[PDB]
Design a protein around this ligand. Structure first.
Ligand SMILES: [K+]
Ligand SMILES: [K+]
Ligand SMILES: [K+]
Ligand SMILES: [K+]
Ligand SMILES: [K+]
Ligand SMILES: [K+]
Ligand SMILES: [K+]
Ligand SMILES: [K+]
Ligand SMILES: [K+]
Ligand SMILES: [K+]
Ligand SMILES: [K+]
Ligand SMILES: [K+]
Ligand SMILES: [K+]
Ligand SMILES: [K+]
Ligand SMILES: [Mg+2]
Ligand SMILES: [Mg+2]
Ligand SMILES: [Mg+2]
Ligand SMILES: [Mg+2]
Ligand SMILES: [Mg+2]
Ligand SMILES: [Mg+2]
Ligand SMILES: [Mg+2]
Lengths: 327, 55, 147, 182, 55, 135
RNA sequence: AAAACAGUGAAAUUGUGUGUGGACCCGAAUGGAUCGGGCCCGUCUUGAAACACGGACCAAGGAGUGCACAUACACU
């Protein structure tokens, strides 16, 4: 397939590695979207109105014969509230139609087999330049994809941490995040969701290292372990192709986790990496193959004109002449 | 009632019926973990669980 | 499709919400539940549910499911209980397989179809049909009854 | 003379693809495959190609699956068989004849069995390479009427009706069939 | 490779389109000459058929 | 502003003089102030407009739709595209034969100057050119 | 019961000034008299312009929802 180069602190490269089998799998934007939608609903907290709101007062209908509509009315005296219209949904201070209630179904199920497959093809998309650019990550200055940082990174301070990331070409991407901060439009700015930022690189590690707490204060950097990598982090908003910094240990682990083509993963029991109904999107081009061109038949390009019935135009198509004969 | 169905039988007639929700499930799981951990310190070298027969 | 708009959203602006102007939408025009079945709903019952109004059969006031639960297999499926790699060994090999149905949760053997491979086999179960016994003995196999 | 000419025209138009139908799936690999067949249809009259193109447009339920043994039973001595659907394993059978299956999908356990006995699975993009003039192919089809839910269609209170009532069921409970014939 | 074979089709089809077009005009020209002679015939046979009745 | 698309220059006046000025006011919006002018289809059992009696007004429908070629065309012979950045004009570079630009209302003075300078060198027509920037 | 900012400040409705008409809508016009067509909406009803009922005027609120159990269809 290919080899990939590891990168040391100073930006030198010397050692090289083979690439895991998961990266040869085709991408299904339908399934990535479906899985995103369901899983995003599992983090909700319930809301409801109070269980007997709008129903507090002593009210009764006046019945017919008083020249008034037969809505329930408030029993009182000494206040302007006497005779006003009480309980119904069309009344000021009355009860809402179908009060919201805690018994609603907040979460959603998705098959384990689809969750596994969606995460596999999300990982794959992180190494196609077309998808990575399409999300809006800018990668003009980056030498090659994917990036694999070495171990033996001995960094402990943020000062030296940024210098490393700059040497990998990430400067323009990081700047794009810092400049982005803005206050949200609408009522969300009152409900603890005040500031919005653009997404940036995700760092994936597997083994505990000091580099994690060196990079984390830099805006737009995000971190997760390979063994519990989530679709919310891999396809934000349900669009795939997030930029990823791999650690060398983590990149080798992808072979144990997803296995090899037409084999069974040891780490994910009962799961195997499958085949589409057609190998590529380009299959329409098979029409031009020798085998097809022998099969078909020669086309007719000559086509009839549309009917015309106007006097003058018709007379040039059918010139009529009289006859004298009476037969 | 119209058409072909399995004949209904849904038991929601009783107005005094209680509902039980499970919004506490993740939190109560975390408490059970933290109780086992602290219990495990109190008797450090010894296993938390006893030996049991096979029947 | 995984998502679709509802009908209720199209009915905004149309007076009757699709229930008719003359017939309307009232509270319970036919009665509650499955009541009326010997009377005004007799035509629904006699068409779709003819064996509803009756008492039938022998009565035991307590029954135990565990004492009566069973699952059945046919002779044509016996070789299928083994894994495919195992099947392909015993097909060529000189040895005779010894299959115990108890291990897969089957207790009774039925006589459906023909045996997959026409070589001897030992089958262990709790009960056999007369057809099953004849078919297994035909290939020189043996049926062993066990608890 | 004319009555024959007319009927022979109707029979033809009943076979050909409609060209105002399209599959509902958002799968781009499936929509690719349909595009190929569609462009072949408008350049041919051959009935097998037209039948295949019409079947890719039908629903999941219309594309009912078949088991390996039933393909062989319907193959009627042909070498290549074609099927717009998924091929499943038959646990009742071990040895099979050598055969080439062109189809939409196959299960893991079926593919192994097919391979051990000698034989090949190809996807429907490759048909034109497997066969030169489509004379050695058979086309095969399942039937959605064999679903277990078809046992309840109709009215059990009609005379001579074979249908089953929708019922609660237990050791003693359950409505019987009473208006059938035996 | 197939992207190159796509060009050979486009070329082949243009030749065929020009060819069929030229063959069409010749038919149209042929037909016009037959039609002239035939109309002169039939306008005279009507005249003959009429005299037969007078006789 | 007095400018015209060069491909339609000798035709634009025929096109303009041919456009309908019909309005489809809601029934009885002339009778009570609580009913706005915006079209809604009448659905009454007795209603004279729904039943299409002579002397009642006309109702909208597909017959009135313009030819596909003429549709959406401004009176200067171009179609319009909205812009709010310098990087938006970059899209029009292939389409300037038939499309023109209209700067969004919320873009302020200092930024508008930068948009117009770019429009001049790329050769793109901007229809709000005067805008707020007259002073 | 009502009542937030000493923000913004719509409609109903009133006075003054300037124009156009004598209930108003649709089609077509003049320098200028006008010509032709149109009964008040919503609703039950075989049948409403009705001597059938509701509607003085404006703003804002205001009615097929949630859960359980079988079901047919589309999609994985
Ligand atoms: K009360
Ligand atoms: K846990
Ligand atoms: K509904
Ligand atoms: K309805
Ligand atoms: K009504
Ligand atoms: K009764
Ligand atoms: K207009
Ligand atoms: K009426
Ligand atoms: K038109
Ligand atoms: K105020
Ligand atoms: K004020
Ligand atoms: K009424
Ligand atoms: K009257
Ligand atoms: K009344
Ligand atoms: Mg309230
Ligand atoms: Mg707002
Ligand atoms: Mg009714
Ligand atoms: Mg009635
Ligand atoms: Mg009456
Ligand atoms: Mg009144
Ligand atoms: Mg409102």
């Amino acid at each position: 397939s290919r080899q990939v180069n590891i990168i040391e602190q100073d930006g030198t490269s010397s050692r090289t590695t083979s690439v895991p089998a998961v990266f040869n799998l085709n991408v299904r934007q339908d399934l990535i979207s479906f899985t995103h939608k369901n899983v995003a609903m599992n983090s909700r907290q319930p809301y409801a109105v109070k269980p007997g709101a709008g129903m507090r007062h002593s009210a009764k209908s006046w019945g017919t014969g008083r020249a008034m509509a037969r809505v329930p009315r408030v029993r009182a005296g000494g206040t302007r509230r006497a005779g006003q219209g009480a309980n119904a949904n069309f009344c000021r201070g009355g009860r809402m139609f179908a009060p919201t209630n805690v018994n609603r179904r907040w979460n959603r199920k998705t098959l384990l087999s689809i969750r596994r497959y969606a995460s596999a093809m999300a990982v794959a998309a992180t190494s196609i330049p077309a998808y990575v650019e399409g999300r809006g990550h800018r990668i003009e200055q980056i030498e090659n994809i994917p990036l694999v940082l070495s171990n033996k990174i001995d960094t402990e301070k943020t000062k030296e941490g940024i210098k490393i990331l700059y040497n990998l070409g990430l400067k323009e991407e990081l700047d794009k995040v810092e400049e982005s901060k803005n206050i949200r439009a609408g009522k969300g700015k009152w409900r603890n969701r005040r500031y919005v930022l653009k997404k940036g690189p995700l760092f994936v590690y597997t083994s505990e290292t000091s580099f994690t707490k060196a990079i984390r204060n830099i805006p737009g950097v995000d971190t997760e372990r390979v063994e519990n990598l989530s679709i919310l982090d891999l396809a934000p908003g349900g669009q795939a192709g997030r930029l990823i910094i791999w650690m060398e240990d983590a990149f080798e682990k992808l072979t144990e986790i997803y296995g090899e083509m037409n084999e069974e993963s040891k780490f994910k029991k009962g799961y195997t990496m499958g085949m589409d109904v057609a190998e590529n999107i380009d299959v329409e081009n098979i029409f031009y193959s020798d085998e097809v061109q022998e099969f078909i038949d020669i086309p007719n390009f000559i086509k009839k004109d549309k009917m015309v019935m106007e006097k003058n135009k018709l007379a040039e198509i059918q010139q009529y002449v009289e006859i004298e004969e009476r037969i | 009632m119209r058409g072909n169905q399995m004949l209904p039988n849904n038991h929601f007639n009783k107005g005094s019926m209680k509902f039980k929700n499970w919004f506490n499930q993740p939190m109560r799981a975390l408490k059970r973990k933290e109780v086992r951990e602290q219990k495990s310190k109190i008797c450090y070298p010894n296993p938390l669980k006893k030996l049991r027969p096979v029947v | 499709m995984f998502n679709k708009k509802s009908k209720s959203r199209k009915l905004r602006g149309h007076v009757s919400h699709g229930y008719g102007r003359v017939g309307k939408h009232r509270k319970h025009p036919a009665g509650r539940g499955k009541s009326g079945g010997l009377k005004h709903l007799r035509s629904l019952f006699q068409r779709y549910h003819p064996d509803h109004f009756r008492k039938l059969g022998i009565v035991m006031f307590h029954r135990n499911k565990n004492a009566d639960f069973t699952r059945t297999v046919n002779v044509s499926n016996l070789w299928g209980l083994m894994k495919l790699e195992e099947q392909m060994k015993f097909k060529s090999s000189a040895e005779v397989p010894v299959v115990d149905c108890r291990n897969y949760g089957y207790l009774k053997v039925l006589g459906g179809g023909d045996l997959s491979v026409k070589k001897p086999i030992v089958v262990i179960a709790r009960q056999f049909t007369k057809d099953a016994e004849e078919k297994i003995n035909a290939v020189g196999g043996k049926c062993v009854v066990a608890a | 003379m004319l009555k024959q000419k007319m009927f022979e025209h109707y029979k033809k138009k009943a076979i050909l693809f409609d060209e105002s139908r399209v599959p509902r799936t958002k799968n781009v690999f499936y929509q690719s495959l349909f595009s190929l067949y569609k462009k072949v249809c408008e350049n041919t009259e051959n009935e097998i190609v037209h039948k295949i193109t019409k079947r890719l447009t039908m629903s999941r339920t219309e594309r009912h699956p078949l088991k390996l043994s039933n393909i062989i039973e319907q193959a009627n001595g042909k070498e290549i068989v074609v099927f717009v659907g998924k091929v499943l394993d038959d646990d009742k059978i071990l040895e099979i004849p050598k055969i080439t299956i062109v189809a939409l999908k196959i299960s893991k356990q079926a593919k192994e069995k097919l391979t051990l006995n000698g034989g090949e699975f190809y996807t429907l993009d490759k048909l034109f390479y497997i066969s030169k003039d489509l004379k050695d192919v058979a086309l095969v089809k399942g039937d959605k009427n064999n679903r277990k839910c078809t046992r309840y269609f109709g009215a059990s209170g009609d005379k001579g009706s074979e249908t089953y009532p929708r019922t609660r069921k237990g050791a003693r409970r359950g409505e019987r069939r009473i208006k059938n014939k035996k | 490779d197939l992207i190159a074979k796509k060009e050979q089709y486009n070329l082949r089809m243009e030749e065929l389109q020009k060819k069929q077009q030229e063959q069409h005009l010749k038919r149209v020209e042929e037909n016009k000459k037959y039609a002239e002679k035939r109309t002169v015939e039939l306008l005279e046979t009507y005249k003959k058929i009429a005299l037969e009745q007078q006789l | 502003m007095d400018i015209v698309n060069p491909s339609l220059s000798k035709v634009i006046d025929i096109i303009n003089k041919g456009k309908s000025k019909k309005q489809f006011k809601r029934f009885q919006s002339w009778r009570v102030k609580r009913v706005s002018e915006s079209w809604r289809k009448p659905r009454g059992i007795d209603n004279r407009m729904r039943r299409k009696f002579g002397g009642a007004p006309d109702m909208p429908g597909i017959g009135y739709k313009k030819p596909n070629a003429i549709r959406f065309l401004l009176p200067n012979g171009y179609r319009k595209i909205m812009v709010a950045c310098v990087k938006d004009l970059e899209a029009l570079i292939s389409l300037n034969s038939f499309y023109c630009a209209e700067i969004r209302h919320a873009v302020g003075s200092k930024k508008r100057i930068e948009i117009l300078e770019r429009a001049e060198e790329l050769g793109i027509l901007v229809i709000n050119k005067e805008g707020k920037l007259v002073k």
